[PDB]
Design a protein around this ligand. Sequence first.
Ligand SMILES: O=C(Nc1ccc(Oc2cc(NC(=O)C3CC3)ncn2)cc1)Nc1ccc(CN2CCn3ccnc3C2)c(C(F)(F)F)c1
Length: 268
Amino acid sequence: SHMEELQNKLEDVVIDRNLLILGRILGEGEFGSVMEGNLKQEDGTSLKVAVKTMSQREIEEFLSEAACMKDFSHPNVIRLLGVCIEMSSIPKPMVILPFMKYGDLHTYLLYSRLETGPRHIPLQTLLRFMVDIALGMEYLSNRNFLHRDLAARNCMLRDDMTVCVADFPVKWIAIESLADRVYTSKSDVWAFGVTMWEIATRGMTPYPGVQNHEMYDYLLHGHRLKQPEDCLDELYEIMYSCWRTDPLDRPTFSVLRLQLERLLESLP
Ligand SMILES: O=C(Nc1ccc(Oc2cc(NC(=O)C3CC3)ncn2)cc1)Nc1ccc(CN2CCn3ccnc3C2)c(C(F)(F)F)c1
């Protein structure tokens, strides 16, 4: 039953706090922090992890959402290893994920334009990053799950250079979502087209010369993100289809993933 499936997911997600050791702080914000850590596994050995730190009803919502995320199983979606709840002199929820030395995709693109960072990224690799994101989003959308914050800063790079969707912004929000609270999978499609543009420009902020407060009017007048300098005509047509006024006219993630795979195969 629906209840039975919920109680099952719930028992699996909690990690005993004594199996975790916390290290140094990697990042900080208003909502919480990211630290490096060690997780003791079933086989007696330890794994390097990333630990994200952040009333009974709010904690219950956190545990419920974490239980759903752990249930996801796809190579292009970040895997949730588990959760811990600490206590202050206010409850402190912690989320445990595998450590990815290359970090977020947005930072990686920027570093590639500098001499000491990763090397220049060729066209074929930029397209492969897009195919990877489309594969992760296709898995999530088929299971009726909404991301709501898709952007290059929320995509992570694995050690084998595979990209996976994760979640640690007016310029990424669909035209219908700015006019009303309305948010569907076709709104994640719009955010995906903007993400493809960030990858193709190697990390540029969307809509140069356009301020956040003048965004809704800009789109209402039919203007969209401009074609990047070295971007193929066929790739621009794919990203432009993500920004069609009527959400029903926009392609699904499954249709996008196939268009992107066919384009990559056609390259020499
Ligand atoms: O990804 C998540 N957390 C996360 C990710 C990376 C991280 O940090 C790191 C860092 C590093 N490495 C480094 O920093 C190296 C360079 C130094 N390695 C690994 N990890 C710390 C935390 N959580 C997450 C939360 C929500 C959702 C989707 N939804 C849930 C329910 N829900 C309900 C309404 N909206 C929603 C949203 C998703 C999903 F994947 F499914 F998209 C994921």
